[PDB]
């Protein structure tokens, strides 16, 4: 069997590509409209367009399963409602063969999707986030949301922006005393990680000697300070848990497990990143089962409507199960497995119902 | 509602130049958020650089307006000024409202400014600091 | 080879549709299924095809019980089907339309597949339209292509639903010619249609059903002359 | 007269079903957005039920016109598909008669949404805020990881402690940082609080009381030398209501009684926004009927997503215009009615397309 | 009153469907519009109804140019219509099914409305099913209720659409009798469908269109005897 497999695969692949394109267009439009509220005469509209365009691949990978579901629905529906699946079945071809014929381009698709995600997506996400943080955080002591707080010893450190060149932007540190009386307050625009130690550029510290003596301010272009934080950790911590590579997630999970800090969120992120082929296959099987059952000879608009409704239901369910695992100590892998398991069970039941 | 309530309240406010404009000392400090008017009872207020003359303030009842709009001192407030008379000579003030912007110590009530050692009493009181 | 549907019956959501209907179709015989739209003619036809499962009764093709077998199992057994609506492959050419079905057969080899392609293409006079795509193809040529596609599977029996419905009287002659040619090879054909006259003309024996049980059977002349069928479904005015 | 009742009943039933489904979906989405925060560091699971039960009326307000829209679409598409609408039009009733019949369910929905906008929703949100503050308790003081930095109100407030007692209060050294916006930091600088132990008290007389064992307050620009340092043993904290600020603005719970009389441009914009929903319902009803003409080729559900996106665009444009209005950039005389006029013109062109084309056909 | 159609024409995407087709239907006679499916028979019927706006030509009922007038305007002028598919009000009683159309008649009081409803209820022998819901009716009662509703609209000509499409031979007599009653009332009727025999039997005059032009017209016997329609539409084997 050659020609029928090629026909079915080409039809489903083209339909899914069109659905993915439309979904990406809508998602980009909605993200841009929501994000346009942050213009501040220092972060221009062109910068917002760049950020949206550079972050597009991440949401493409994010919305790939629903796009595959909807595209497989409509495409197979076109062939069925047109009365050709009946002919293919009455020729001797079994339902399993049709399912495998649909699965083969789907195999290609999830292979490609896992590849593009795990390799490209963190890179573009890092570029976009670094650009946005650079655009926003070039302000004052602390004037940006995309910043980080950290404490070492009795010195309190804040960063306005972190860049992929190890160049922290807008760092401020307050040094205190055992009695916790303020002694110095500093702020430097830029900070560079030399191999031996961190280095500053054009610090603007001030000195407040504890007694009533003269309060002075001292400026040094290249003050030096030492800490334990590293840029390799810096780029990982600022990024969202949904944006790192699979290998990066694994390494950071091991790093957190080494020192005992809880890492359930990154466990859930790893589980939803790795198990993407399983959820995609379950959803596509459910779509195939719908096409062969109630959605036999209905209009294409009805197919699209029920597809988007089911996709919204599935996304809402799996988003509810995410934080619920953290709240109720519920093992994270279950939160990914259950919606897919329910979907696959319903699909196989309706397929067995013929 | 009392937003902030402190015991043994000591304030050290270094001015932009580096010399403390004023340094609040008090047994207690109180603040309200619903109205940012603040009550400070039983303080010992010291303003060495707030005025050219060293200033010692001993208030039985005191009150400070929102954002430092106004300073209300009640119940025979003793304020010290240093003219050629070097002694602080805490000066009794029954009730007054001091504008921190120009140190305009407007008086809401008749004030009997009497030196601790000598007699400098004045009947009535009219406030023109500007 | 004979197809025997014995004691077929089925009860739908609230009311039974078919009760104890029996049909025997032989290889080389045309049999028509006729009856009121309310009666279970379409339901029984779909049981014989296998689209709807039957609650009771056995269907066997040459001593092989195919009741449990699904539609693909029945198709591999030898039963064929054509739907009333257009069923051509739109984006695929006619030659590809026949070749896709030819690839399904396990017995035939590459040389055999090509030879069978050429034989069916020349046989039904669809040689001139091999390159043309299915969508642009006309209605009559579409019916010829569908018939050739069904025949490419080498079915022991082929079942037609509403073949004469919605067809101009000049083309029903071509339809009967194609039916006769399918007869010539030995394949038995079962026809269900709304148009009484053309079927009672074409098929040798007709089965008339009502209330889920057959009421009359025999040749067309005996079908016309029977009083029960005239009272209920034919009418006194007909013929 | 009978056809009036028939059509009204179908529209009402379909609108009820669509409204129920949409309300379920929106409530679920808000539940995700709320449960994320409640999971990470803040809020308590016990108060979510009250929050949703008090926030529902606004969602019902924003949903009901859209629910009527689709209802109209689905019911009249179903009537067209089964040829009832054709045999009706083959008797002598025109699309103007259709609009006249459909206005009555539209009027009922307009009455309901007007009630929700004017009275129920502001009262609901006022009760939301007051009852939240009264009974609902917070967990920023109750549950913390000591080494973990806690940020409040996004970047404005950051709270950190060295160690927190599980029984709450009697903590270790605390680091409290607040950077108020609206040039308040420009006036003085950044205020930071440091204490030795601190004590948290929950009660009815005071919402949340924090008493330090020994503490300090330093306030001044990090680079500039002007600082204010306050030294003490005890200190206070009072009326902490983080969520209610993020949930709704102060203008949202303002009753409509004093809203129109006031001269604040924000309140004037809010008044126009609250009165926008009935005319929005009427415009949606006007532009819905002509779009319901569907032949069996394209089915019934084909043109539901375009309607959804059109309504979302309508709402977004309304929100943007209201924002520019309360900012004062847009003149108040023109106000908010111009977008409604534009959408009414679009709907009118859509409704009169066929008669105008026939007239152009001479 | 006569419904007169002159020089009608239509052009689709890049192809003209109908060229110079003229018809005349007069009150009190039955006229059949027949032709091949590809030809502009359905196009002419629809552009007579008003579903599709004619590109050229004038359609006129008693000296009124009703081409530009919409469907409601035509209905007010005197043209009725009955769709092919079921068009009964599902969730409405039969008596209300007729009253909903009777109420829109301006020239009637309440007493006259009740009297007309009773007369129409009694005339078509649908008196006893007045309380049953619209969905519950079977085929024949549904058709009778539809025709009674169309009469309740008080038209001058009713344009039937495929009355004998998928109808049992016994139930055809009821439709024929109802058309005879409608003609006897004084209402001209135009019929178009694919089943040639019955429409040729009932109609007084038949109009045949092919390639978008009226190839032949006349009484049924003349249509049977004409050479061109037999060659291209009817077939030599026919009749």
Author numbering:
A (entry chain G): 1 to 354
B (entry chain C): 47 to 176
C (entry chain A), E (entry chain B): 2 to 240
D (entry chain F): 1 to 362
Sentences from the paper on this structure:
The IM sub-complex comprises the ATP-binding cassette (ABC) transporter LptB2FGC, which extracts LPS from the IM and delivers it to the periplasmic components of the Lpt system. LptB2FGC is a type VI ABC transporter consisting of 5 subunits. The LptB cytoplasmic subunits form the nucleotide-binding domains (NBDs) that capture and hydrolyse ATP. LptF and LptG possess transmembrane helices that create a cavity and a translocation path for LPS, as well as a periplasmic β-jellyroll domain.
We also obtained two cryo-EM 3D reconstitutions of LptB2FGC at resolutions of 3.26 Å and 3.61 Å, respectively. These two structures were assigned as LptB2FGC-I and LptB2FGC-II. Structure alignment of these two structures gives rise to a root mean square deviation (RMSD) of 1.2 Å over 1324 Cα atoms and indicates the main difference between these two cryo-EM structures is in the β-jellyroll structures. These regions appear to perform a rigid body rotation motion toward the outer leaflet of IM, similarly to what we observed for LptB2FG. The TMD and NBD domains of LptB2FGC are similar to those of the LptB2FG structures and represent the resting state. In our LptB2FGC structures, the periplasmic β-jellyroll of LptC was clearly resolved and found to form a trimeric interface: LptC and LptF form the primary LPS transfer path, while a loop from LptG (residues 209–215) binds onto the N-terminal β-jellyroll of LptC (residues 60–69). Intriguingly, in contrast to previously documented LptB2FGC structures, the transmembrane helix of LptC remained unobservable in these maps, indicating its flexibility and a lack of engagement with LptF and LptG at Interface 1. This, in turn, results in an unobstructed entry point for LPS into the TMD cavity. Similar to LptB2FG, we identified four lipids in the transmembrane region of the form I conformation, which likely originate from nanodisc reconstitution. However, for LptB2FGC-II, the lower resolution and particle counts in this conformation prevented confident lipid identification.
